[PDB]
Amino acid sequence: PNYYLYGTVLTRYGLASLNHDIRRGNKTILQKGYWNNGKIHSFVGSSAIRWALRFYLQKQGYLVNRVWDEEEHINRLTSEDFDPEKFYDDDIFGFALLPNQRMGALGMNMAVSLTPYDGAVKLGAKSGREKDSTSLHFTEYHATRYQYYFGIDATHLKDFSRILPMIDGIMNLPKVGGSSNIFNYPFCPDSLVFQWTNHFASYISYCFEYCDPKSKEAKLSQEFIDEVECGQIDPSKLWIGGTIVKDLQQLDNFESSPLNKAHIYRNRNEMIEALKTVIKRDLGL
Amino acid sequence: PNYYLYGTVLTRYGLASLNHDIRRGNKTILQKGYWNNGKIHSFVGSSAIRWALRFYLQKQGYLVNRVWDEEEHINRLTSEDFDPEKFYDDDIFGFALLESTPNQRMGALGMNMAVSLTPYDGAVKLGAKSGREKDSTSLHFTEYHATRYQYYFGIDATHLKDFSRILPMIDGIMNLPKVGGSSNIFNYPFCPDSLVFQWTNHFASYISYCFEYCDPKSKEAKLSQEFIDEVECGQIDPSKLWIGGTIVKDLQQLDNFESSPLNKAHIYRNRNEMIEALKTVIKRDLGL
Amino acid sequence: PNYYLYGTVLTRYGLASLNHDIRRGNKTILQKGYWNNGKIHSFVGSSAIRWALRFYLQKQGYLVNRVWDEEEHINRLTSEDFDPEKFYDDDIFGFALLPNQRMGALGMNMAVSLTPYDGAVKLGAKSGREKDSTSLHFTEYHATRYQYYFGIDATHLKDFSRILPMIDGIMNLPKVGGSSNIFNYPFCPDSLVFQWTNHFASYISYCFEYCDPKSKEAKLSQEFIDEVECGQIDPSKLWIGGTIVKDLQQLDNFESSPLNKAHIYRNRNEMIEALKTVIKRDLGL
Amino acid sequence: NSEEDKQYLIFIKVFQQAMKGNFAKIYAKTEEGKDPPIKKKVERLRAELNYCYDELSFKEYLSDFLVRGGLNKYFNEHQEEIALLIKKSPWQEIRIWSLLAIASYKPKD
Amino acid sequence: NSEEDKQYLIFIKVFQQAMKGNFAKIYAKTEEGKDPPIKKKVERLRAELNYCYDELSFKEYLSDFLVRGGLNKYFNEHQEEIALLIKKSPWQEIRIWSLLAIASYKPKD
Amino acid sequence: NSEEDKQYLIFIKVFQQAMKGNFAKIYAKTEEGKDPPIKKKVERLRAELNYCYDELSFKEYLSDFLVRGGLNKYFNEHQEEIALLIKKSPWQEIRIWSLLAIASYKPKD
Amino acid sequence: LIQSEEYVDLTFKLRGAPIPLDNGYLTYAALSRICPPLHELKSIGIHPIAGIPTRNNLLELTAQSRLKIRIYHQQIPLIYPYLAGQAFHIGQNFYQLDIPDYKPLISSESVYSRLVIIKGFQDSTNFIEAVQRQMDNLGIQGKIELLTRQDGTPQRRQLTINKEGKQFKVRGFGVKISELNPEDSLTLQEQGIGGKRKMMCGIFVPATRSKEEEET
């Protein structure tokens, strides 16, 4: 049976400057655009997240084709001919040469800041004297928690067991973005909403929303709760965990609500273990 | 009788770079054009949705003449002669064998291009091949669009060779697979979140594009005032109207909703219940 | 194996004026922005803290490529070519001239004031040559404790023994800002929350919070306590030391709480010594 | 004729005067025998104009730009209608007009 | 002859000067033994010109290109005429004029 | 020859050079195989020229094609004359001249 | 030419819907609701909002329109956390304040007050002698001049206090004061004259605003 793992991931609160626009001049423009309710939100590209996942796969010793040098800062291909059977990265993310193409089992959307981007430019002077091009400079940063949506087609994997390393990498995601020297932003999830179902329909994309346009507090959107309560989104297939668990449990009439029947774990590791057990049972691993 | 199932389905909010245009330079542009008020909206071709429906029919068993390889990205025909009696795809989408049973068929499904509910203003995403080495295939740009999509379709149920094939088509419209596009970096689920279906026995529809925006840069979607006026004036029999999805909450929050004729339509907040009721009515009417 | 040292360090209370923004007009305005609860908080750039750590490395006698004159206020390079194998500076902080570049094991974030900025300003008379004229100008000062988040990739270091001088420098941090630091604000830690783990995920980014908006004492955030209690944070990998330990030990049910089995020391030096012993055991030093 | 273009033109003129005042202020900023850049000043102005992200950005920016422009005579005779044109009209159109004014500024000096 | 034709011709001259400035900037950007672009930058300019939906975007790109061109005398002498011509007129016609200028800029270099 | 005849011949040569450039680009892009098609390119050009339905679309296509051609030395030597001829003349006559240039084209041996 | 110490001008950039030209109690009540400590302060004044006049008796907010507060520089930490970055509502519209900027109190030979209110003095002569007496209490010497309209009549203004159901009538004049010398000029600028200092009236400002108010 065609099994799909859909999930929306919310990151922790912090000062973030991960993806920048075209770099020229004084300001390093944060990658930003319009979002809900017509306000400018800072974005993190999905290509960066895919690169981070591939880097995690590399660092854990899994066999991959593309290897990050970490010294020359270039990408090396172990085999010129892509082989999804052998290499994890080719199987998961696909490839295109220009069989020389593969759609890949992982589909991920761009990361969106929960909070709109208002201000917060940084001063980038370099010591004193010799005011060259490395002199007075501006860097844009955003104090928010990013949120992204991904979807895995488990049956599309050449090796069905490779989904578990993908979940582990989503859990322990390495450095995403570039300004890690001055803006160290961990991208590990602090709130998760996973759905392990056998339908192409997903209703959990970008389920989180803010309570105050300038606060770190996060809350599941009323649309998602209404979707769960109406009858859509089978609670048995819904996996919710993280710091959103406390807010969900403090809600009134939570016990009578259908959301109570979903797999809700405050500890993310417990949720991941239970979900991996279910996935291994369903995929015959 | 001649029964037709018309419908306008609204997708979910999200970054979408589904349907692109000619390669041009280093920047992949969306398929866009003027839609309303002289503003430029982004479009998703109806051929993409038809391909997605064909893929759904293939994945869930069934008999389809066209089989997507999904490995070599090639299309294979099980039978060189199209047989609408046996194959689902030939019966539903038709065929045209021009190279030189009838060689041509009009198909029972008629779709229209999906139109973004929100005007497309900016939203170009920088893309880099990374590394330290640079080359021609290093710096590229991809257009995206944070909007809901809305398309209109119509089914001539009597035209189907097998009348029971409408049900898998409705299921596919509900659980639509990915619509052709850059799903690697812009994963956009095309499953409906609001439905306006009409199961009538005459050709007039009047429900082509019933969804319109408010605050043009927002995700909020409402039912167009023209459609509501059409329902209230007397046209569009409420008993033939099936409304389901997240628009149900907004409809029920309207003032004088109980006294409005729109209240007599089949309104279900849960899409599955609405689909089940509509399929029950369809099976009763088609003698299945 | 890959080993990482994540930590949040809390500074001591006192008047602070560090890393000022653009000195437009006569006023010297603090670097401030939005933080949790949508209130204005004063920030300190992480580049200044990295410079302070590098200056500590230079002063302690460790071989560093970049040397501060301290008199001419000019940075000089011992060797034009960067050699991370021999220089502590190049091994730790990386380099880039534009192996011509190195990422660097150390990764930090900006220091954030614990309490929201109260808007206090100070009047000062600066010297003038116009017949000994004195012009009144405004300098902003914030009486608060700063907290910053840093991340260490021990494996990325060319020499694994270089982590200990980094910890010593973090503990004995020199003056930050230098001339711009009007009031001498000690940036040495007052309370520490360290984590010596082998996972990319860290949930100790900013674990400190204020009980009242105007207070000289700090409390661990309820989110961090919940994360420890649920089981997400392994107590064996958690290191807490400083003044916050005294407040923690007075909490009810502390013995039964999972926070007790974490490495907790009232004295910062004892915790640092124990953590360094653990690191040396794990890194094979 | 069709006074919208009259407003467009005196907006261009006031922008040119304000930018000239700002280049004069920069001339005051620099010192000693280093050549004060002129083309680089225009490049910096263009980069800062392109730095904005709608509404609040570029509106407070261009208002501050006009304010630092200094004593602008045509602005003094055209405070109210220039302010009204600023408040109305899309911001990207204002940016286009400002860029055209930059491209046509030179023959003053 | 005719005012519209003269404005069109000197706007072509303005655009050609702008491309001269941009190509000189690209020449300055490249260094070492790498061959500076001549034809592929023209192809890039063509691709950017055809990448233009609606009006706002094309006018924004045209103004940015004119400013990036830097110093130019044909726009210097004629402020009102070219300002009105760019502000008015369909953007497709101005794109046609810009392409015609591109195809005939090369006698200069 | 009258001046109109001279401009008409120069336009024919300009279009022929543009086709030379476009066909050279196709040759470079399609070096694979026994030989890149030549008759198919002419048929494509004829179909695309006949696709145009109004003045704006045809002139946009003509400018795009002319720029894609390349240097176009005959356009180098005749900026004003050819530009005015393209801007002024009815698009049907320009299409007739372009198709005549297509018919009278000699591929390089 | 003397910058006053111990007194500053906290200026918040103001944006929102158009507001009545006689905000007064409106703005004061909005700020009091946002900032409870503002009610109990004593030596604090709110500047008249600076924006172009629109139709009716409304005032439109421009990019240069800003809420400016004159306050003892040691009392800023009592109202800064409540105002900096927060939002207040006038009627049904939401108005946002950003991080404020500090402006020093400059001395000027001629100072202006757009509105001065003294209880029980409505005629010009009694008002003038009352302002002279108020100068005598603060020990300030200067010549009192009254702002005039296009007709030359002394200008009067009205303050509408919407306390509870009833609406209240408080009225005053707008004066121009010169011949003060910098020290007494600063003293009058900080202290102000009359009452209702927080009520967007009674504070002072240079005479450029006097001429500007005279124009329209």
Side-chain angles (χ1 to χ4, degrees), chain C residues 41-212:
Chain C
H41 286 243
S42 42
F43 296 135
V44 171
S46 40
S47 52
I49 312 172
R50 298 177 123 263
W51 188 97
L53 189 49
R54 175 197 260 96
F55 190 54
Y56 171 93
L57 278 186
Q58 160 177 337
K59 291 301 289 188
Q60 225 57 359
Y62 301 103
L63 183 62
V64 296
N65 187 9
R66 221 176 75 176
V67 160
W68 188 241
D69 204 292
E70 312 139 276
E71 295 97 36
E72 290 86 286
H73 303 41
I74 177 61
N75 254 326
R76 77 183 64 262
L77 280 181
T78 282
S79 171
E80 202 264 7
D81 289 349
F82 297 95
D83 181 24
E85 286 274 6
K86 187 162 89 42
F87 292 116
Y88 279 59
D89 193 325
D90 300 357
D91 197 347
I92 284 159
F93 300 88
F95 44 85
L97 69 80
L98 293 186
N100 308 343
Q101 49 206 330
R102 177 177 166 82
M103 215 219 306
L106 180 65
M108 299 204 15
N109 231 326
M110 287 165 87
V112 180
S113 64
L114 214 46
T115 87
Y117 177 43
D118 41 24
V121 71
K122 181 149 290 181
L123 255 294
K126 71 172 183 178
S127 294
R129 313 176 179 184
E130 311 171 356
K131 207 186 182 90
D132 205 10
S133 58
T134 57
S135 59
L136 275 181
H137 89 123
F138 289 6
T139 206
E140 288 182 340
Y141 73 96
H142 196 185
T144 179
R145 332 157 79 89
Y146 285 93
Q147 63 167 335
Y148 63 94
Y149 170 75
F150 72 95
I152 303 176
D153 185 11
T155 281
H156 195 50
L157 289 164
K158 285 311 184 65
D159 187 12
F160 283 58
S161 64
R162 298 204 161 113
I163 184 144
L164 323 183
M166 290 216 315
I167 304 179
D168 298 342
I170 286 168
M171 298 294 314
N172 322 328
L173 203 62
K175 277 309 151 54
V176 177
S179 71
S180 68
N181 187 201
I182 297 134
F183 319 90
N184 274 346
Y185 188 68
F187 231 80
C188 67
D190 177 47
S191 305
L192 302 143
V193 176
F194 279 4
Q195 173 149 274
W196 176 250
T197 179
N198 37 1
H199 300 285
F200 296 85
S202 77
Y203 297 98
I204 63 157
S205 54
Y206 289 87
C207 30
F208 291 102
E209 85 165 356
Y210 56 91
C211 32
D212 298 336

Side-chain angles (χ1 to χ4, degrees), chain A residues 46 109 158 203 205 227 232, chain B residues 12 71 184-185 187 192 271:
Chain A
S46 34
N109 221 342
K158 280 313 175 65
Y203 295 105
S205 61
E227 220 90 68
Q232 203 108 47
Chain B
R12 269 169 66 71
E71 182 105 12
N184 55 325
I185 58 176
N187 191 41
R271 285 164 278 273

Side-chain angles (χ1 to χ4, degrees), chain B residues 185-197:
Chain B
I185 58 176
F186 291 108
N187 191 41
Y188 194 86
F190 226 70
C191 58
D193 90 0
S194 324
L195 298 176
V196 176
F197 282 7

Side-chain angles (χ1 to χ4, degrees), chain B residues 7-186:
Chain B
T8 286
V9 8
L10 182 76
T11 67
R12 269 169 66 71
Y13 192 70
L15 304 172
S17 182
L18 302 175
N19 226 51
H20 297 114
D21 207 313
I22 281 314
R23 150 174 337 124
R24 206 132 309 186
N26 67 339
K27 165 137 37 185
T28 69
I29 56 179
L30 304 181
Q31 168 69 231
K32 38 184 181 293
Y34 293 101
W35 174 241
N36 263 354
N37 335 328
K39 309 310 235 333
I40 281 190
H41 293 239
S42 61
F43 295 106
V44 175
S46 53
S47 56
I49 318 180
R50 280 170 148 267
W51 196 99
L53 251 179
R54 258 170 145 128
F55 198 55
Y56 171 90
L57 285 186
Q58 163 177 346
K59 293 299 279 187
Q60 320 260 304
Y62 298 138
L63 257 182
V64 278
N65 202 348
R66 270 233 317 261
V67 174
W68 182 244
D69 201 298
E70 204 173 0
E71 182 105 12
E72 333 194 36
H73 303 284
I74 206 65
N75 262 330
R76 308 184 196 277
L77 277 169
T78 74
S79 160
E80 68 282 4
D81 298 354
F82 304 97
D83 187 22
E85 307 276 353
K86 188 160 79 267
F87 302 116
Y88 277 60
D89 62 336
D90 290 354
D91 191 7
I92 285 158
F93 306 91
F95 47 87
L97 193 265
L98 312 176
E99 185 38 84
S100 63
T101 60
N103 294 349
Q104 330 192 339
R105 179 176 163 81
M106 200 225 309
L109 174 70
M111 213 146 278
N112 224 315
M113 282 196 347
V115 185
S116 72
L117 203 56
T118 278
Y120 164 78
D121 51 21
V124 53
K125 170 78 190 48
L126 149 85
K129 193 32 199 63
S130 193
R132 192 67 277 283
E133 54 86 41
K134 252 36 94 330
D135 205 8
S136 59
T137 84
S138 177
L139 194 69
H140 61 276
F141 295 82
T142 295
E143 287 188 340
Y144 65 95
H145 192 184
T147 174
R148 304 167 166 268
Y149 275 98
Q150 155 207 30
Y151 61 97
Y152 161 76
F153 70 96
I155 307 142
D156 182 17
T158 312
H159 199 230
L160 281 162
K161 279 313 183 63
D162 186 11
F163 277 45
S164 64
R165 302 202 165 119
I166 178 139
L167 270 57
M169 251 171 45
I170 306 177
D171 299 340
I173 286 165
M174 287 315 294
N175 316 338
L176 203 59
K178 70 158 274 266
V179 165
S182 42
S183 167
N184 55 325
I185 58 176
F186 291 108

Side-chain angles (χ1 to χ4, degrees), chain A residues 66-165:
Chain A
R66 250 188 45 200
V67 173
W68 185 244
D69 208 275
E70 313 168 81
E71 313 234 326
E72 273 58 28
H73 286 95
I74 75 184
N75 270 329
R76 304 185 183 276
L77 276 173
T78 60
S79 168
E80 63 282 346
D81 295 352
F82 306 95
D83 178 26
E85 308 275 346
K86 180 174 29 175
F87 298 117
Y88 277 62
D89 57 355
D90 291 356
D91 187 16
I92 281 154
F93 309 92
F95 48 87
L97 182 129
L98 313 189
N100 22 308
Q101 327 153 63
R102 171 169 171 79
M103 195 206 268
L106 172 68
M108 172 132 39
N109 221 342
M110 265 189 25
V112 187
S113 62
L114 193 85
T115 290
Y117 168 79
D118 41 24
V121 86
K122 186 54 177 21
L123 260 287
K126 187 196 77 187
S127 271
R129 303 172 181 176
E130 311 177 5
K131 300 187 181 302
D132 310 352
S133 63
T134 59
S135 183
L136 188 297
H137 203 81
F138 291 92
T139 297
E140 284 186 4
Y141 66 96
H142 196 182
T144 176
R145 35 175 76 226
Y146 285 96
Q147 141 183 265
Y148 63 93
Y149 163 79
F150 73 95
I152 297 153
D153 181 16
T155 318
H156 194 74
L157 281 165
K158 280 313 175 65
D159 184 14
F160 278 46
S161 65
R162 302 204 165 121
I163 183 149
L164 270 51

Side-chain angles (χ1 to χ4, degrees), chain A residues 6-119:
Chain A
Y6 301 114
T8 305
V9 165
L10 184 76
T11 66
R12 313 188 23 90
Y13 189 72
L15 304 151
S17 192
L18 309 177
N19 261 208
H20 304 106
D21 206 317
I22 289 294
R23 296 204 265 258
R24 68 305 155 271
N26 304 343
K27 274 215 214 145
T28 52
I29 286 317
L30 221 58
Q31 168 70 71
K32 48 184 166 280
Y34 280 107
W35 193 235
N36 80 7
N37 73 39
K39 302 178 140 13
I40 291 274
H41 282 243
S42 63
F43 289 118
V44 171
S46 34
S47 50
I49 313 178
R50 293 174 131 255
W51 186 97
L53 243 192
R54 191 195 258 95
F55 192 55
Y56 169 91
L57 286 181
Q58 163 178 340
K59 297 290 284 187
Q60 302 291 125
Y62 299 111
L63 190 51
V64 294
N65 204 351
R66 250 188 45 200
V67 173
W68 185 244
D69 208 275
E70 313 168 81
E71 313 234 326
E72 273 58 28
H73 286 95
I74 75 184
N75 270 329
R76 304 185 183 276
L77 276 173
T78 60
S79 168
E80 63 282 346
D81 295 352
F82 306 95
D83 178 26
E85 308 275 346
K86 180 174 29 175
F87 298 117
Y88 277 62
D89 57 355
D90 291 356
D91 187 16
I92 281 154
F93 309 92
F95 48 87
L97 182 129
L98 313 189
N100 22 308
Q101 327 153 63
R102 171 169 171 79
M103 195 206 268
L106 172 68
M108 172 132 39
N109 221 342
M110 265 189 25
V112 187
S113 62
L114 193 85
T115 290
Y117 168 79
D118 41 24

